[PDB]
Design a protein around this ligand. Structure first.
Ligand code: NAP
Ligand code: NAP
Ligand code: MG
Ligand code: MG
Lengths: 655, 655
């Protein structure tokens, strides 16, 4: 079976992260059999030593000599650590000299929570491990590739990273999905800079058959119980948030209704809000009578996670409010309920597959090693396995109008939050539109610095003097700044989130004979992700937890005079953020959250599409206001049908 | 170099159309070297015999015996002929038994004209050769594949066939682009029906280095002269159409201004329409003084093509109007002008390439033969070469509003054409919207049959009685029906084109042990293309030539109860038509035609997205009216900037 392989990559040097197991281990194995010298990087020394021994033994069987010189390992390499990535490259160049193939394969599953349960530091960790590490190793190895005249960078992405002009929602996996999309977007935007010497592509396999204790989650008991526990969390949280919106009682007083932990008692309480009574009826109806979740509202773990949501949304509750909660007797969910959910998850994944069979890690690696021989592709995403039924979200519509007068009527008297700093003209125009045209009660302007605050206060002095425009300085503490806005000015209706910072103007590749010292650094790439991705994630997480009505995520602006590097970085951000917007849109829809989250893009693909004179610029800015109103005007009560609700969440439109 | 190849496809039988040269010849060569028995089909016997001899000689060199039994040919096979496709399959099964790989490679360049210069029969020929033939051979060979438990269908598409959620405009190549998109869409929608036994995928190479006398046009003197002649045609035609719109003189009287064939005389004529005087100034300014096109308006070949445009748009001119046209002396365009345009075309294509090198036919076929070994992909489009800078048009935006009141004001007093038959509720609602809400002067309802006409007249009896609704019966002569509307009721402003026919409800695949006798036939697939693609092309061609202001192309309707086969065929049509809409949008924009052409989709990807109750259905139909108004309301004079004009052409939105 190896005859087609031997010789295919003779003379090449390959570095494979995550190379001791999974797809990466098989890619390393087959590259070695094809004649490449390989360096396998991973954390655990023992697994690496086992994989190295297996590959070396196989090489000797087919006739290679001195096999210890053909397969090396780099243990203790956690790709989320920049220092360990630097050491990995030093070790690889010491062993083999210049690297020909960089196989960016390592990937972690990530936080595996909904955005509103996702710690900010966990999000950042996923980005460092799965995305920033890919840039870091490219930045270290591409100079030598260019100097020798050839090289290859392959980012191992996922079907769930989306495709060129469509996002694929991956609920409960937003950090992972964003990291996978960024891997593809990196190949898409760097290809023109890295050519002609260097190819850069992504692979995006679908679910792969593998070790059922590891993997990054695409392939198929405790997870089923966790699904049922987070369903109970979502239903309780949505009903409490909704009740608090239209009831005079505080959130504290509403949570006190749950403390007897008695489903029937809550349903039968004539003074309980209708949303909580109807929820209790559903628990009793939809529940297994042998499960204590049909008669008890909560257990202690759900209660703690619910309390965290409420605190993180700025609701005031004592930390010991659930300390005396009656503990429901086992089982909270029955074995039958758990096995039913488990079969549902498994059958759902298998039902995606047109070919009705799961590919193996060996199969996917074999297709990948053949693909690596192709010298005429760059900026592409190859699907070594595929044929999947799954929901997708097309991006990049440009033809749109204003929202309906019915939706615009919902803005009268509203509290609007605007977040930004450097897009001062856009912020001024938006504040004036909401206040002067659509009857908003007031606008809270949340900026990064005092200098940004004073600039906006001067631009909006008339509304500042009239008490209609308030300004808050957030720095790097956007969540605390939103809490100040909630306490002092009230919870937001519409929210618009623009980036604090502009895009950098440094080179993206170096000249063949340069040291690359001015090229975008590993730290600067991490800073780019912080200001243009993590910024929006933090705001979306906080605003959803705080019961905002709508949220527009706005990408950086490209213009007719943006540098070619700014266009590349802007389109990288636009594609990668689409994965976030699509995923959180579906998350919110499926868990009965009312918030509408969408994306408004100030970035275009090509300079020739941009406005060229003051008239066209006026047209563009009017389009921006129309786009933001189209996604932030709330749906009136007789409109938020199942059908309309899916339309108005998770979308991206291009100004 | 062949060691990786020998054995890879041992025991397989492959049929390759277009197999005597080009990419198809190399695919046949490398499949044979990999161990497959191959049948090569093409028209010319001599080229096939040469290719067969070359492959057989190479097989004997590497050790195969009885090579005459491994490479067969089928000469005289024109894939546009259904009878010849039937004979090809009979000949192949007689030689080899069951076919394992169907390589649908044959492709013709097509008409190579703008839509408004494209004969309807030439369009149809391209569809038969490049797209309908692919279904026909699948329909004949898939039953045997399924019966044996395995098979592979590969459609050789093009980069310019687009990708999953974006169209790629290919100006002057609409027939070709549509055929390439349909090849990909066929793989996308049939994969779930053909699995698990049968894989179906497309390849979409970019430009390939090949024989410069053939090819399908993607790769780079007479073509440069033709480009310059069609630029002169476009500029004259656009100025005449525009002048006739706002001048009291007939088209006949306006063309009489051109008959002295004197650029300076037309520029200096104080009684000539400003659009013609300004055009003449440009000819004198932008022209090479050594070229007679700088002092003469036309030559006889341009004049004949211009007269055809005008006649085909219903303008009345004597057939001999140019019979006495003064013939300009050679050269009409200088060698320098022609070489400059030639370098422009070549450098443009080469400038697309990130890797700055053209792939060879051998390279692309090698990557394709490796790809064919992958058993875990279906419904995918593999790019064996790629890395291209090129404009794309994302499809499938769902979040839109009404158009601006400024654009809606442009509808007051307008003449509207509506085309359709089976979507009677949509036609009634649209007619009533234009007449009752937006002040249109009258609506001409163009249907297919008398029964359709009477149904609409009854639904709209009040507007019929008031003379606001006129009805015309088109049958299979839509162009003659539009000419009747022009003569009797005036030229159209907005036009809406819906399909006459619904989608069929027959099976798309047969049971393993059936004769497939009820499965969608080759003739029924051709009929599908006629009613759901060629219908829109004929209307777009005629309405653009007749100076319509805007045109909405509307796809079939899917609902919550459409059959699974209807969803598949509807999405096939939606994807394939996007290629047409995007291409003609850019064609119109680049040649200064004012018409706005866009697509409104009544098809969705998934049943779960459809309305489920009367309220959601009401919401859907309101969205349809809003979508059609958003694309058909004309741009007021102070709005049709370069920037806004590109936004409002070539787009597709999903209701
Ligand atoms: N699995 C699928 O179905 C699937 C589908 C699509 C895409 N993908 C992509 O395929 C790639 C590999 O996935 P997989 O299923 O093979 O994953 P996996 O089974 O978890 O991969 C295990 C390998 O990764 C190493 N590794 C794990 N965490 C690491 C870290 N932080 N730093 C360095 N090495 C690390 C492991 O060794 P140590 O634990 O000792 O570090 C081992 O070498 C990922 O990029 C993933 O996103 C997978
Ligand atoms: N060329 C490119 O740059 C490029 C790029 C992307 C996609 N493609 C796709 O690649 C495929 C092959 O393109 P190519 O460049 O190889 O084309 P080509 O050079 O014109 O292909 C020549 C082969 O096609 C046969 N052929 C031509 N017309 C035929 C017909 N009507 N019926 C049957 N056989 C016919 C020729 O033999 P006879 O003349 O004797 O019939 C010969 O076998 C097409 O599907 C094309 O759309 C090409
Ligand atoms: Mg701009
Ligand atoms: Mg529908």
């Amino acid at each position: 079976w190896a005859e087609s392989l031997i010789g295919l990559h003779l003379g090449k040097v390959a570095l494979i992260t995550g190379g001791s197991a999974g797809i990466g281990g098989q890619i390393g194995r087959l590259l070695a059999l094809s004649g490449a010298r390989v360096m396998l990087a991973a954390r655990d020394r023992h697994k690496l030593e086992q994989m190295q021994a297996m590959i070396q033994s196989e090489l000797a069987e087919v006739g290679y000599t001195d096999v210890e010189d053909r397969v090396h390992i780099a243990p203790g390499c956690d790709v989320s650590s920049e220092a360990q990535l630097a050491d990995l490259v030093e070790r690889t160049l010491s062993a083999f000299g210049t690297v020909d193939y960089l196989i960016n394969n390592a990937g972690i599953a990530g936080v595996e929570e909904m955005v509103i349960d996702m710690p900010v530091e966990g999000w950042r960790h996923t980005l460092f491990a799965n995305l920033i590490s890919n840039y870091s190793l490219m930045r270290k190895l591409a100079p030598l590739m260019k100097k020798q005249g050839s090289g290859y960078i392959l980012n191992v992405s996922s079907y769930f990273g989306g495709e060129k002009d469509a996002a694929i929602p991956y609920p409960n996996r937003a950090d992972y999905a964003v990291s996978k999309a960024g891997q593809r977007a990196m190949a898409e935007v760097f290809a023109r800079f890295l050519g002609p010497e260097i190819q850069i592509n992504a692979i995006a396999p679908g679910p792969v058959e593998g070790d059922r204790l590891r993997g990054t989650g695409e392939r198929p008991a405790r997870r089923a119980r966790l699904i049922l526990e987070n369903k109970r969390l979502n239903e309780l949280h949505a009903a409490l948030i909704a009740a608090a919106r239209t009831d005079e009682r505080s959130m504290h007083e509403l949570v006190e209704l749950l403390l007897p932990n008695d489903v029937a008692a809550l349903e039968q309480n004539p003074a309980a809000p209708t949303a909580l009574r109807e929820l209790a009826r559903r628990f009793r109806s939809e529940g297994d009578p042998a499960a204590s979740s049909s008669s008890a509202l909560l257990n202690r773990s759900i209660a703690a996670k619910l309390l965290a949501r409420l605190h993180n949304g700025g609701y005031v509750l004592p930390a010991d409010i659930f300390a005396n909660l009656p503990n429901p007797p086992d089982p909270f969910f029955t074995r039958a309920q758990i096995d039913r959910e488990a079969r549902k998850v498994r059958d759902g994944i298998m039902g995606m597959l047109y070919l009705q069979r799961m590919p193996t890690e060996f199969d996917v690696a074999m297709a990948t090693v053949y693909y690596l021989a192709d010298r005429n592709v760059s900026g592409e995403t190859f699907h070594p396995s595929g044929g999947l039924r799954y929901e997708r979200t097309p991006t990049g519509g440009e033809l749109f109008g204003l929202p309906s007068p019915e939706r615009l009527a919902e803005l009268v008297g509203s509290t609007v939050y605007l977040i930004g700093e450097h897009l001062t003209e856009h912020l001024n125009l938006l504040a004036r539109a909401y206040l002067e045209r659509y009857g908003a009660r007031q606008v809270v302007m949340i900026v990064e610095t005092e200098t940004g605050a004073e600039t906006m206060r001067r631009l909006l002095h008339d509304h500042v003097e009239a008490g209609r425009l308030m300004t808050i300085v957030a720095g790097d503490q956007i969540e605390a700044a939103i809490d100040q806005a909630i306490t002092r000015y009230g919870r937001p209706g519409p929210v618009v989130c623009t980036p604090f910072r502009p895009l950098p103007t440094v080179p993206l590749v170096g000249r063949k004979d340069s040291d690359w010292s001015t090229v975008l650094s590993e730290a600067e790439f991490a800073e780019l992700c912080e200001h243009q991705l993590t910024h929006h994630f933090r705001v979306a997480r906080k605003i959803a937890l705080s019961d905002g009505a709508s949220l527009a995520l706005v990408t950086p602006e490209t213009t007719a005079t943006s540098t070619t590097e700014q266009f590349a970085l802007a389109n990288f951000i636009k594609t990668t953020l689409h994965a976030f917007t699509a995923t959180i849109g579906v998350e919110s829809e499926r868990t009965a959250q009312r918030i509408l989250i969408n994306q408004v893009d100030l970035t275009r693909r090509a300079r020739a599409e941009e406005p060229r004179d003051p008239h066209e610029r006026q047209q563009e800015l009017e389009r921006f206001i129309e786009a933001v109103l189209l996604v932030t005007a709330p749906l009136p009560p007789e409109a938020d049908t199942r059908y309309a609700g899916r339309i108005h969440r998770g979308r991206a439109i291009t100004v």
